[PDB]
Amino acid sequence: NLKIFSLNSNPELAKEIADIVGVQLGKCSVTRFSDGEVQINIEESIRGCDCYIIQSTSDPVNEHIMELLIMVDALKRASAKTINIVIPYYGYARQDRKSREPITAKLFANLLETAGATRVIALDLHAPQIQGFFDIPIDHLMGVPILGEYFEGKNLEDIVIVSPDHGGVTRARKLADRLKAPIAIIDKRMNIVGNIEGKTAILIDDIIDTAGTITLAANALVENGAKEVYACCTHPVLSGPAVERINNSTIKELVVTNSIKLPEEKKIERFKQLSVGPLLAEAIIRVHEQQSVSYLF
Amino acid sequence: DKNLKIFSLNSNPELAKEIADIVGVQLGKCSVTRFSDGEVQINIEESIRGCDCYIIQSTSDPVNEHIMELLIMVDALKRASAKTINIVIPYYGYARQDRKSREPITAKLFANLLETAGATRVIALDLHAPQIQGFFDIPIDHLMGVPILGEYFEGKNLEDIVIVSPDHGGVTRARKLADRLKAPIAIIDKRMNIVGNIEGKTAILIDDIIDTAGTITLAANALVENGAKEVYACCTHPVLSGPAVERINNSTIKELVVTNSIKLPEEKKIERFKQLSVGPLLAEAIIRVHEQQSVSYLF
Amino acid sequence: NLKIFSLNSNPELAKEIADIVGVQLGKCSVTRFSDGEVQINIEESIRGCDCYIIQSTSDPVNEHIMELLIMVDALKRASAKTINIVIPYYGYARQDRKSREPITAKLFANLLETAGATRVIALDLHAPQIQGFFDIPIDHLMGVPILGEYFEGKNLEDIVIVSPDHGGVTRARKLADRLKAPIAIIDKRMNIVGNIEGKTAILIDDIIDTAGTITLAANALVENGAKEVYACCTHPVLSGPAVERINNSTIKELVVTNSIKLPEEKKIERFKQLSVGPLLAEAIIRVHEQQSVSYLF
Amino acid sequence: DKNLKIFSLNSNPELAKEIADIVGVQLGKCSVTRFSDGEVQINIEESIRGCDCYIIQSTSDPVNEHIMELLIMVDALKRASAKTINIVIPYYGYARQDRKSREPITAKLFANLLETAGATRVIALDLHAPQIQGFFDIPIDHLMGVPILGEYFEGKNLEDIVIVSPDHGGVTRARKLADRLKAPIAIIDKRMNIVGNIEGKTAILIDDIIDTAGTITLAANALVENGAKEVYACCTHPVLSGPAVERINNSTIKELVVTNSIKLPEEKKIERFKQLSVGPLLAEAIIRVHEQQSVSYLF
Amino acid sequence: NLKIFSLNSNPELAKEIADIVGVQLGKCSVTRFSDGEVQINIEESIRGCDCYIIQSTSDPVNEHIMELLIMVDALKRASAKTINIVIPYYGYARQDRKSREPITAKLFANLLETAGATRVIALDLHAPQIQGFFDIPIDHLMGVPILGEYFEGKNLEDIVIVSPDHGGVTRARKLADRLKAPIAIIDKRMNIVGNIEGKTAILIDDIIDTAGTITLAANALVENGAKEVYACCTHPVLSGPAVERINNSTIKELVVTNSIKLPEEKKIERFKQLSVGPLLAEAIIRVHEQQSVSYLF
Amino acid sequence: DKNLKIFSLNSNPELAKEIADIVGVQLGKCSVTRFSDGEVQINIEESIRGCDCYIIQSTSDPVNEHIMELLIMVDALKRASAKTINIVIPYYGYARQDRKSREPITAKLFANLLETAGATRVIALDLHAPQIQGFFDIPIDHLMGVPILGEYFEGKNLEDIVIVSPDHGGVTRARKLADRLKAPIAIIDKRMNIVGNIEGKTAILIDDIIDTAGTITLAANALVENGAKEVYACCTHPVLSGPAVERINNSTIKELVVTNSIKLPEEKKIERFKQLSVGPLLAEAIIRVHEQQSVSYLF
Ligand SMILES: CP(=O)(O)OC[C@H]1O[C@@H](n2cnc3c(N)ncnc32)[C@H](O)[C@@H]1O
Ligand SMILES: CP(=O)(O)OC[C@H]1O[C@@H](n2cnc3c(N)ncnc32)[C@H](O)[C@@H]1O
Ligand SMILES: CP(=O)(O)OC[C@H]1O[C@@H](n2cnc3c(N)ncnc32)[C@H](O)[C@@H]1O
Ligand SMILES: CP(=O)(O)OC[C@H]1O[C@@H](n2cnc3c(N)ncnc32)[C@H](O)[C@@H]1O
Ligand SMILES: CP(=O)(O)OC[C@H]1O[C@@H](n2cnc3c(N)ncnc32)[C@H](O)[C@@H]1O
Ligand SMILES: CP(=O)(O)OC[C@H]1O[C@@H](n2cnc3c(N)ncnc32)[C@H](O)[C@@H]1O
Secondary structure (H helix, E strand, O other): OEEEEEOOOOHHHHHHHHHHHOOOEOOEEEEEOOOOOEEEEEOOOOOOOEEEEEOOOOOOHHHHHHHHHHHHHHHHHOOOOEEEEEEOOOOOOOOOOOOOOOOHHHHHHHHHHHHOOOEEEEEOOOOHHHHHHOOOOEEEEOOHHHHHHHHHHHOOOOEEEEEOOOOOHHHHHHHHHHOOOOEEEEEOOOEEEOOOOOOEEEEEOOEEOOOHHHHHHHHHHHHOOOOEEEEEOOEEOOOOOHHHHHHHOOOOEEEEEOOOOOOOOOOOOOEEEEOOHHHHHHHHHHHHOOOOOOOOO | OOOEEEEEOOOOHHHHHHHHHHHOOOEOOOEOOEOOOOOEOOEOOOOOOOOEEEEEOOOOOOHHHHHHHHHHHHHHHHHOOOOEEEEEEOOOOOOOOOOOOOOOOHHHHHHHHHHHHOOOEEEEEOOOOHHHHHHOOOOEEEEOOHHHHHHHHHOOOOOOEEEEEOOOOOHHHHHHHHHHHOOOEEEEEOOOEEEOOOOOOEEEEEOOEEOOOHHHHHHHHHHHHOOOOEEEEEOOEEOOOOOHHHHHHHOOOOEEEEEOOOOOOOOOOOOOEEEEOOHHHHHHHHHHHHHOOOOOOOO | OEEEEEOOOOHHHHHHHHHHHOOOEOOEEEEEOOOOOEEEEEOOOOOOOEEEEEOOOOOOHHHHHHHHHHHHHHHHHOOOOEEEEEEOOOOOOOOOOOOOOOOHHHHHHHHHHHHOOOEEEEEOOOOHHHHHHOOOOEEEEOOHHHHHHHHHHHOOOOEEEEEOOOOOHHHHHHHHHHOOOOEEEEEOOOEEEOOOOOOEEEEEOOEEOOOHHHHHHHHHHHHOOOOEEEEEOOEEOOOOOHHHHHHHOOOOEEEEEOOOOOOOOOOOOOEEEEOOHHHHHHHHHHHHOOOOOOOOO | OOOEEEEEOOOOHHHHHHHHHHHOOOEOOOEOOEOOOOOEOOEOOOOOOOOEEEEEOOOOOOHHHHHHHHHHHHHHHHHOOOOEEEEEEOOOOOOOOOOOOOOOOHHHHHHHHHHHHOOOEEEEEOOOOHHHHHHOOOOEEEEOOHHHHHHHHHOOOOOOEEEEEOOOOOHHHHHHHHHHHOOOEEEEEOOOEEEOOOOOOEEEEEOOEEOOOHHHHHHHHHHHHOOOOEEEEEOOEEOOOOOHHHHHHHOOOOEEEEEOOOOOOOOOOOOOEEEEOOHHHHHHHHHHHHHOOOOOOOO | OEEEEEOOOOHHHHHHHHHHHOOOEOOEEEEEOOOOOEEEEEOOOOOOOEEEEEOOOOOOHHHHHHHHHHHHHHHHHOOOOEEEEEEOOOOOOOOOOOOOOOOHHHHHHHHHHHHOOOEEEEEOOOOHHHHHHOOOOEEEEOOHHHHHHHHHHHOOOOEEEEEOOOOOHHHHHHHHHHOOOOEEEEEOOOEEEOOOOOOEEEEEOOEEOOOHHHHHHHHHHHHOOOOEEEEEOOEEOOOOOHHHHHHHOOOOEEEEEOOOOOOOOOOOOOEEEEOOHHHHHHHHHHHHOOOOOOOOO | OOOEEEEEOOOOHHHHHHHHHHHOOOEOOOEOOEOOOOOEOOEOOOOOOOOEEEEEOOOOOOHHHHHHHHHHHHHHHHHOOOOEEEEEEOOOOOOOOOOOOOOOOHHHHHHHHHHHHOOOEEEEEOOOOHHHHHHOOOOEEEEOOHHHHHHHHHOOOOOOEEEEEOOOOOHHHHHHHHHHHOOOEEEEEOOOEEEOOOOOOEEEEEOOEEOOOHHHHHHHHHHHHOOOOEEEEEOOEEOOOOOHHHHHHHOOOOEEEEEOOOOOOOOOOOOOEEEEOOHHHHHHHHHHHHHOOOOOOOO
């Protein structure tokens, strides 16, 4: 009785997951009328089923958010037993606190619960406490282990983990612990805090948006005598001049995951993308059958 | 009062600017940008603590983007301690998805989203279905727009006119206008056929919304094909998506009358055309609502 | 684990349904104390069962509404697994919009959900959008097909479907499509709009309340040269002088359903009542077992 | 203020008219008819936008009809943008169904219905159970009615009196009156027996409600049968259903004292009887509540 | 799939129950940090299970209330299927009505539902209508039968049941009906109402807190010529000088239940404690398997 | 206005008394006792019907007792018809339990409890996590406390200073202070190691909370061990549980700076120490909030 659907955000990721678990993406239409309104029409009875919806609320965030919500509404109204959401990328998660502004990450939670979600599955939220913005169950998969493993495997010499900013220090520590390495941060107010001479430095953030912060960081590192420089993040937002900026940066290589569907029209040069499909696929099953999900950490 | 702060999001600023000027107030200062990211950014550069904020926004194309900024705004205001957050919606997008099989009822989902976000009340103009009004549990005032069009045509001084309902759902609206003008009604039983006398008459086609202009142009031509003196068309909401304009410019429609509830496509112009403003009405509605003077008086 | 109960509105309809599906109406007392308060006392354990309640909120609407709500409350408090409501006739559905008035159809929805309903099954609501006044699942059975079939079977000549008023046009179309006939409406402000000379006209509304609107319509038709006249509606409210007015009308025959229990003390003369028990009975099962309910349209 | 609009539904208009006159206000104008259909119709012919509306209604026989109109009224008002919708319930029907097996707790369901409909607050008089007060989450002020009856009897100047509790639940209420009159108490341990000295005494029977008058008449007669000087009976809520009147007119009760919280049956009259008004109290309660002057001062 | 947990209130009672039903108290830590905050850490996957929590909100009420709530939250967030609460002693139940005060018994209900409870099982609430403060199902076990049986068994002569105060009369009647005895009350404003000369009197209240009310009652009885005096209550709160006062009273014997864990440091002399474990144990099962719970009255 | 009623529960009365005196108001009269039973008793001896009540309470040790009385108070006030029930929390207990496995998120449960009880809004000071702010849906103003400490140190006129983050989460806070003082930052990468130049410097250790004083003392000593001119330490919330005091009195900390958000242990005194008051700030916050004057101006 398990049905999985993919909306428009990251279909390639969604089929990969579906194949790993072993089902066919649901028969559903997420269409559009002449104006600009979405017309969801579920092409099959899901009465009493456990439906999983896969969707990253990546660019354009508002459109993806709305179709997600409308789908939920369609499912709820159509008598699904559970409506479970799998969000590889939680858009608006940076707007998690306040001088005279909204807290969109919270508004979203509230919208999703209103719409009718039963539970949520997420990957590396910008702030781990966003988890508390919900009152329905939510499982938080972490993504650092994946990158750690790819780096661990690289066998680089005297490496140092670097936090591009003041909020990254925790994440940097998590990765520093894996590779058993020291940490240093970019005190950009721009300055380096910590020994980093002749070292292989790895820059890491949760999201690489405009690639502004990070490229500037990599160059400063080099400018301060670092053997070579790598950069990784979970969510490849790469908006604006991001690609051009990186292709021109000193970054030996950029490591990212497929939580967000890559821009088809512009390619990073030195680059590697790891998949998170295996991880989410495993969580679906484990949640669907009620097996320890904590077992994956 | 000085607690009447009014904001305009991106849907129809010209209309907003107008309703604010008419009222006699400066549009609240508010950063309503989008990050390059596409996510919506909001700064409200003016303490609104304890104020009564009115937000003006049509959820017209693109509906999902406008809906989201509206919601985010509300959230900003609620979190920033506004006293009341009142929504003025000249055009309620998704009002066509008002029932089901296995389909959603987006007009209802929206209501639910808006109340969740934190709205205090709503002001609307000609909803596709008057019962959408009941999808809310917060107060909502529903302004009719027919009177405005009625009046334009009345001063046109036409003779031998018949009001026409393009479809099976328009009959009520057609009646409202037929009354206001003391004219008979006829409908297009498109299954396509005319039901009622219309020979040599000046026919006025009326719908709440003119979207693709498909339904209506085809209607006008059929009228002509059935010997009607001349043909006019009106609606409140000018959605005009797709080939709408081209289709009308080529239609037999002597003239198309619409309101400025939805911001007109800047890049394509109807030829024989007239747009009436609904700013005076909403401005009036806001005032009455704000000071608690009867508004039923409009309706 | 399926239990069905009948309150006081339309017990004959309720037993018919119960027999079709195959169970015994629940052991429950819907009594009254000396004053005028209802005393519900469920004569059997329904702990963990799926309870279906059958009730039309017909005259007197307020009494029927209250017992329904009290029953729900009794069931909820007694640990039913699901409390599902089957409403053959949704009273107050005409009060679905606003000059300075309530929207009772919405207040009701809200009351029913507060009381504890799990879902609703309805037949021909005055306004299809009332369906959206709820946030719990609701299935809307339509009743026109039934009447269409009885008319289709009649083999009448050059028939025309007539909408007694400006709101009936949609319904009229639905029936016009069945019998493959043309439509005409009564533009009562009173006038006929459309060809209807020498035709067999069928008047149709969702409800025939005081029978005012409709009788006056039938006579006007005749007065405008119509071969003969029939009239149908789903819900036979027939309040006031309704019967007398029809018995005196020109209506060759009046077709109605048993959604509302007929006045025992006054009989229409030329008349036919079709049952909706088979339809609802089928919906119960299909909902209870989770089979496509959309399959019935 | 002029924002104190008061409405009366059908339960007890004489009482309502009185509380309005006392306060000094004209009862809000409101069509509160029923369609022939039996469904309840409502028009509120007077903009109440932004006003503070008080609704007066006992949910007495028929309880379900009165409950429904009350709810529909509230809905009308909420949808029509009243500022506050405050309910004044002289008699809270269903207060006897206050706990369970497989039975409902209607007093609670009601609270939940009233809040759902949209009430802002409630004012009540002698609930069958004081803890019903906790079934709400909106503010509720509970007026006691014993003081009123206490005072009538006090000025009667009787001697050698004993307060009697008709049953096991009345003992508290009996105490309240025994105190207010400095008298002893005795109860009817009906399982039927007297518990306490009562010989040659003037006994006063008191219950919150006198419904079928079954319990109480039988009590009075037993008292007499046990040598009591004379017997009086009082209660706040005169439900008097069934054979109540006949039973009392035939009882040994020298006199029955009640309040006008429930509208008296027009077609049958008690013989030896006295009705005290609770209008002055509620009127007072409304005023204090409305201007926010302490009301605990009553209680 | 049934798991039972015990928090800190009455663990002895909790194990007794667990043994009767047949399971092991859950693997969970209800710890404390240096400051004073509780750290709940559920030592095992309960995903999809039906969890029963046993806890009396006895002294200290606020601490016990908070751990209960935190546990619920932990369970809800951890995906329990149902979170069912067994409360042998409902603290704050005397604060059930209002001159300018809170109604804590109601605030509590609201807190418990917010936290995430599915249902409640309680024993002798101070006010039976507290039952209505909830909107989730609640089963109310009564405790008088137990004491009745112990008294019935005692074979005492011409006994009279006594209500220490004006609110106890109902409870007194329930017990008077068991032993087929008459009732009398203490009209303390202090006076006796009813014949009680040379009789064996049994004083009964739901709770014996400071033992003030009751000891003073017993002595008055004696002072009015009563053959001998016994006293019973369900909930042994015994705060303050309670024990000393009773040990010095004329009470031949005090009968109580183990709904509240007895003060380890001070012992009543003439005393008997009956267990309520068998009763609750039976309710767990019957609720868990959905069998008539009403069957136990 | 005279509708600014302020109450103090048991957490930090000296602070409360101060914020009330500063504002210029008499602390609302309210019995806030506990029965011998241990259950909390509440009488509010002063009609507050229609008033705007502010409650001051840190949910410091014992957290559960303070939380419960706060909730019960709110309940009392809500049931007693207060107009607004506004909470001032100098110290938000449980802010450390802000995420998960199989653990609760008590900071969130609390928010949910407070809103259920009936709060209208919240005023807080330096939450452990700024996003806790989003756990609420009622308005909440978050006051930063760094400015206060910044200023003390600024007037100390030190030279060659470095701000130090005891741990991986403090880096932001350290930056805020480094900025306000134009100093560099260094952190303790305790996995224990120093990251950044700190030789011969005057180091200031800063955390939001100093609980067991474990983390920080060990940090100060390591600094010294790495050749730092001298060492100071500051935090907003002085939890000082366990061996905290003893550990600091023995540490190398030249001086410890804290605020009075949490009431100091009466039985044990730090030696080299300075406590700054946050009363002026909250007092100011209350006023701005109450009259609806911008408060962002603080932050
Ligand atoms: C760097 P931080 O400590 O994560 O601070 C978060 C800030 O980034 C901003 N922000 C939120 N949405 C973002 C977006 N899409 N574009 C850029 N930054 C974002 C917000 O103003 C927020 O206060
Ligand atoms: C418009 P109607 O003929 O009164 O019936 C409503 C129908 O319009 C459809 N619909 C909803 N959104 C639409 C849109 N943007 N464009 C066209 N039709 C739409 C619905 O599927 C529904 O079947
Ligand atoms: C004919 P319509 O377009 O369905 O308009 C509905 C109107 O009928 C009225 N109405 C509602 N309840 C009704 C009833 N029981 N009696 C008569 N008409 C009703 C309402 O005032 C409502 O506005
Ligand atoms: C009235 P009591 O003796 O205090 O106990 C309450 C009982 O009255 C019953 N009851 C509820 N509604 C009633 C009514 N209208 N008439 C008589 N008894 C009723 C309940 O079933 C309950 O058992
Ligand atoms: C004797 P009663 O009729 O049960 O009245 C209940 C009263 O006892 C008081 N009360 C509540 N909590 C109590 C406690 N823990 N200590 C003493 N009495 C309590 C309350 O003020 C309440 O109004
Ligand atoms: C404090 P951190 O190093 O920023 O990470 C938060 C951790 O502190 C823990 N925690 C929560 N409450 C605590 C308390 N009172 N004392 C110490 N740690 C606590 C949580 O378990 C969580 O793992």
